[PDB]
Symmetry: T
Subunit: 161 residues, 12 copies
Amino acid sequence: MSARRTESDIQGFHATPEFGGNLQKVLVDLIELSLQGKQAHWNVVGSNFRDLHLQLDELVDFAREGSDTIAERMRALDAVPDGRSDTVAATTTLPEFPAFERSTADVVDLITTRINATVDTIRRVHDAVDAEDPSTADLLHGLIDGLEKQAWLIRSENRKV
Amino acid sequence: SARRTESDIQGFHATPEFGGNLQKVLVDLIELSLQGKQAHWNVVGSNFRDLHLQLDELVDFAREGSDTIAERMRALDAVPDGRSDTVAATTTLPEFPAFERSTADVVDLITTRINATVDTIRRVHDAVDAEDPSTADLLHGLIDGLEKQAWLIRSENRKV
Amino acid sequence: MSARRTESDIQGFHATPEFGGNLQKVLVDLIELSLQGKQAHWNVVGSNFRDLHLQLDELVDFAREGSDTIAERMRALDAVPDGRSDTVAATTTLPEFPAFERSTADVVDLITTRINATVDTIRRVHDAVDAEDPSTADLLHGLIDGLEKQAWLIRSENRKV
Amino acid sequence: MSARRTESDIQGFHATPEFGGNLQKVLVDLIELSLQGKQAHWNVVGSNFRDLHLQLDELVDFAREGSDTIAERMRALDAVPDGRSDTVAATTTLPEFPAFERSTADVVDLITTRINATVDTIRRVHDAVDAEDPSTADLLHGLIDGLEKQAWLIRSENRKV
Amino acid sequence: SARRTESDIQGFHATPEFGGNLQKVLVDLIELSLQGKQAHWNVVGSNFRDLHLQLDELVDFAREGSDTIAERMRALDAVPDGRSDTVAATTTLPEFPAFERSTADVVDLITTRINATVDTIRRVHDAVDAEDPSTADLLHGLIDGLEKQAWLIRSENRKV
Amino acid sequence: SARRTESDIQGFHATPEFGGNLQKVLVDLIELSLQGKQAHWNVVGSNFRDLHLQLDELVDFAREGSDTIAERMRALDAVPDGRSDTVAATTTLPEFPAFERSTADVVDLITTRINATVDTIRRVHDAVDAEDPSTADLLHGLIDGLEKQAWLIRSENRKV
Amino acid sequence: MSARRTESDIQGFHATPEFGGNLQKVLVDLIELSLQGKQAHWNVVGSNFRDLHLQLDELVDFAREGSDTIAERMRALDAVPDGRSDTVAATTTLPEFPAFERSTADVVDLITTRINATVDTIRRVHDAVDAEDPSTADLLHGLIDGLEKQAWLIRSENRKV
Amino acid sequence: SARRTESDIQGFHATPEFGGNLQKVLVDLIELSLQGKQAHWNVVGSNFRDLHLQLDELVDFAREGSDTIAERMRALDAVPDGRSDTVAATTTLPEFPAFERSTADVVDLITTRINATVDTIRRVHDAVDAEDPSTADLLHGLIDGLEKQAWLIRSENRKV
Amino acid sequence: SARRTESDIQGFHATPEFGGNLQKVLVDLIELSLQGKQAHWNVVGSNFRDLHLQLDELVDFAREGSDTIAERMRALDAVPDGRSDTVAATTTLPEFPAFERSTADVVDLITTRINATVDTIRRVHDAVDAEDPSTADLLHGLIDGLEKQAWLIRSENRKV
Amino acid sequence: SARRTESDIQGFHATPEFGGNLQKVLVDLIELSLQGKQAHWNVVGSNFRDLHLQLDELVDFAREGSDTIAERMRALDAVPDGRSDTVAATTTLPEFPAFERSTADVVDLITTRINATVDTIRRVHDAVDAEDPSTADLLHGLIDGLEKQAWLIRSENRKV
Amino acid sequence: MSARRTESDIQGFHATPEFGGNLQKVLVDLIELSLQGKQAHWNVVGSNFRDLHLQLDELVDFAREGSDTIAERMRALDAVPDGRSDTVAATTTLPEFPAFERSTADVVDLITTRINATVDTIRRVHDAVDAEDPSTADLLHGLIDGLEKQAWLIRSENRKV
Amino acid sequence: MSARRTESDIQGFHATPEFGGNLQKVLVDLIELSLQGKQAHWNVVGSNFRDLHLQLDELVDFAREGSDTIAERMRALDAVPDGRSDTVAATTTLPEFPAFERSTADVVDLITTRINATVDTIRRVHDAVDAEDPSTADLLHGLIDGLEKQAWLIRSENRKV
């Protein structure tokens, strides 16, 4: 007990409400991205169907894992996430996805646009999130890297050189 | 010798009633997935770890079922619709509370919503089987899986 | 634009006592088949000993999984299964196995007869079980075809052409 | 020996000759589909070569497994399958597959046509097969589902929207 | 050189008392398997999931041990007997209640049953080991596994 | 700086004799696969399980070999032809009986047909090797595998 | 042209004694946490015994991996770690664990406080560690977030509504 | 039948001397784990990699052994004690030097430590086995594993 | 504290009689591996495949056992000898005939050889165990495995 | 309803200085991979096996790192250049000798080259982080991995 | 011991310098092929991006394994391989790969040309390598087979039928 | 349009006694190599003990697989192998291994010479084996190159500068 601490109750780090809202925005955008990825996965037709069909499923898997990680971090810092359908639909920022069958060029353009919007949201939040908690800033770094790689892999088909 | 001659053989096509019934199943499965994840995150109390893991198993099963139904919908040449606006506006499952809940409340809520989800499938099964037994089999599998999950979740609060 | 239900206490499907009794018949025959299969697995001797030894173990595995599935189905439909040794011994319909070491042909004949008896019981139950619940009818179909495959694989050894 | 049966030889289900022929038709169509799938797998060239090259191999795998299951069921019900080359060539119903290298659009049209023909045969046979044995009707359900999924995944390439 | 000039060399044969003792072990293991599955199905109440899984582990271990003992009995050229009539008429474990039980009752019953099963092996071990240490080792392994399972199940109800 | 300049470098092209010899190999492998499956289904008698499993191993090996040969044919810019009409009209394996056969008859038949296939491969190997050793290597592998399968199947009926 | 370097004796990054002392503090706290986690794993008893038993094993695994990573980093930067029992016992800051059998509520409270103390130590050190070497700052981020997740999973058991 | 008519059946309880002996084993296993990790980190010199890997294998084995012994102590209803203060105050292994040590010195030190650890088990075995052969088997396994590791670590310094 | 103040601690040393007994075990295990492989290659007749696979399992087990015994001999600081000249000049198993044998002859020969191998271990066990129970345990394991293999191989020719 | 309207949302674009710095990293990673392979092939002497395996591990790590950096360059819409001419003309690592080398020389050379590779990354990190922390994180990972490899290789020749 | 040899030092097969150079040519071409494969893997854009992106990675993997096998054989026959960047760049025979982003058709043509050049080099060397060592000729056979299969799989995209 | 053969009793390839004797030589040398490798594995001691310990085990595994392959080829060509201990000891050509504990340098030298002797035997046999059957010549090629690689990995430790 030379250097041992005599404290009987050691408390943890608590996030501020601004921190909670800044993480909530990321959460809702990731959930909306998952839903739109599945929709575009089902309803795409045309030339080069198979490759896009598989890449969209990879995108959806990554988005689901990321959203779960963010929500678990919010719980770990003693905040309350909200991932209900009403809240997601009412407060998401991604533009609405059109219905019916869409050819592959349209799907490529739409998905590139929505991935870019999600990454923009993460980039806007990162400044304050890093100024408060670098450990959460690191998770944001990982999400940005993954989403940008997926965006490149999807948008590269439609390039003309 | 006995080979066919036709070069443009067509396949089976679903009717609009078929499409509507499968849409009714699909929106409920997606909403169940979302509510399962919410209850997975926001539960506290005793047996927290057990409910935490069981809800993740339920969410996995629901996601797989929804994908199977949507793929069958496309295979029979119909168009599924799983957007957030449509799900939130047309689902029949009751809304989930938004804060932390003790485990007894989560057990009751999840049992209620799984029962509603199974009731939808049991309601549409008669017409779906009258037109396509192959899809009736998928409905049978969904009913069996969901009922087993409901038993596993609801058995915690039994009195004796 | 909102169709959510209000009813907060929704109850599930409830099985009838006749349904429970029929599934009980199925369960008790499966358990007895498992026990007799293990006995024949241990005490067989003669020609093709290794082949009969392995096939009987595969049959036992299949029977155990089937009985577990049926019992879990009863519990899911809010009925109470009964798989105690006294009940199985006093209620099962399979004729009893001889006690000592049996040559290969005798074991083949006995196992073919008992598997046929089990499948006959399931077929007798299927009509009412299907008239009440097709979801359970599907499990009955699976058990029937698995057991018939095993019966062919075991009985085909002794057939002479 | 209270409720135990005293029967010394219990016999199983026997299939009628009409049942045997109804399953024989399914068997020969599946084998012919496997052979044509391999041919189209080898000889396709043009744009989007790789995706079709791999999807055809998945189709061949599924067809082989289904054929083996049907033949094993036929043996289980004391019927005799016939999968010889002369019988398949003389009695199959699928239209003949052209030779030489074929571009991808032609291969997609041909394969969609032949998968639809196979599914049509199964659907024609299912009524009587189900009226006699639901356990075999269930296997027919599974085959129809798998084949229709493969048909969608192959035909979706040439859709113009 | 030193090679042995025999054509048929005879193996080790067990005595009837040895066979009877191993039969006593085998019957109890089989009855434990059946009772474990019963308690696995019909348990219900608080902390349902953990008991639901631990009973499955116990049943798996009991089945493996039973097969090992029966194979040893055959290897020493004796005849095992694992029929339902013999098990039900000659087992020593107390009877299991027939309806669904709360978790505390299941824990108490399973602890008692495992204790009886281990007591049988401890009674038989001296006589078995006086003849065959190789079978004594199998008995050691069975005792170890059963006692660990008994601790893991019984620790639920301790109050301290 | 020893780099080449040519920008339209062409590959090896097979001759029509090369293509004919590889076709002769391919049709026999496909017919062997079909006959193996038939014998796998329709055998009864003693050692039924053993022949049942061995024939499935043989069919797997034959399928992989035929695929390798056809892919080599395509790689050397020749066109394979594995349609059912061509196989039935041009194969050299003797016709297989159409009913249930006892195991001795199946052993004899399968040994005869495997020997015929290996004889065809050995007949074409001289010219195929004199033109392309890389394909000669694949033929060596096929010969080795088929001979091992023939031994494993034929050894059951040996006299002493 | 050619930009190859000439210097044939190229030296690496060297850590300062303050850097070494800070990493030593982190290492000793991780080792003490591993030992206390194993003790609590063995001697807990009561309700939810199985769940606490498994979670404590996961905590011990994570702590062992973290301590090994920190010690290997210290070696990689030409510093010498100390992991001896006398040094750990005389230097660690975590309060000592009670000796006998403890009910699950007491174990939950004790483990929550000890994990919080360990995370507080890492948080205090991270400032200087990051000011000198961000590559090590990243490892500290990983340890912090893993430990906070484990703390949430353990402490959530006793929360009331 | 022959079923036993009891409701609560008591198990086997270990004596305090039994608990003390198993505590003596446990403390040395934990201290050996810590010293193995220390020598793993701080070794340097010729043939660094082989020692770096063998010490990790030794540490894994020691950790598994200590866990098995402590679980057995709990199963026989005794209370283990593996706290840092108790280990540092009551272990019998000699103290380990604190800086970088060349490979020959590390080999000598680890051989000495493993020999002391095995000597403790050999001294305890007679008294433990006079009461519980099932625990005697665990001691046998520990002795075997540790002696094999001692051979593998000491063989490098032999000169012959 | 209680730490021991030594620098070099001596381990357990095996006596030459102990070494000779373990040599007697090792030579027979190696010879059994060789004879098992020979019978595996040259068997022929009815039920060929089953013996062809069972002999391979027996050879694998014998190889692992011989390696374990040799490593134990090295661990107790003795020197094994497994050269071909020593095995051929000192083994006790009867010689194996050199041509193709029917399955009944092979079954009889292998049963005789395994019985001789087990008899050697049973003769050695008392003297080994009186000194080292840890090695007695390894002998127990070898005896168990060989007995089970002998049962599986001999059970074909039993008539009843 | 707070959804965006913009339908041509653009991404983050790297600057030419960013591209140049990442190119500086990439050429050194490729050159280190090639030199690791060379030293892997042409080493002789003592501890040959250990260095043989460690150099393979280092080559694997370097290849994965170079691929990650190139994919990041493409993701930020920059064009990597990893051709042999560019690598040979612009790399900064000292040239590797051409014949077979004793192990001490290889250890010294590889330590020097890994140190130079890490120095390049530490030089570019300031600007890369001031522009994009997400890429700064990848550079952190590369530095960590390379430094651990350097420790594991260089610890062989340390005096005490 | 009638047949035992009394030799105390038996030496192995040694390759001639011409043999060494003949294998050196194969080594340098394989390394250059690996580098160009990775370059084309990174820099390709256009239609059907994904399939080519993955096939080039498979080609690179095969080339790396082949080069390792050849270099280890060269060491085994006691020769000294040389796989340095200066030597490869100065002495390779494959034509230079252009820079910047390249559309898929151009990449297909370039990769077909370079794989054909590599196979031509191996075929040129095989005659003498076989006249000296059949065991090495066998490795050359394996390399030729693998490379030609990859060439077919890559060039089949541009065929017009 | 029918080319089926009539010959119903078709015989395979039969090996000559000289062929059988040559393969017998190869088999006996491989078995003796396995035995000596295990001996050296057990009794080596000194520096680099662990490395030689593992390498000798890998060599023994390779030799065992090779001997099994050669014996099965002998059986497949209808010849009778003989791998008894008396025959191996009387007819092997490898020099006898020393009995007691031996340092690592001595083991390296001994194993190098014995592997070279085995490969020399295979090379002496390959000419006639290939002149009669190239399919067996291919197996000989595989054995030669595997053994030479093992010889390199073992002998390379003792090379000086």
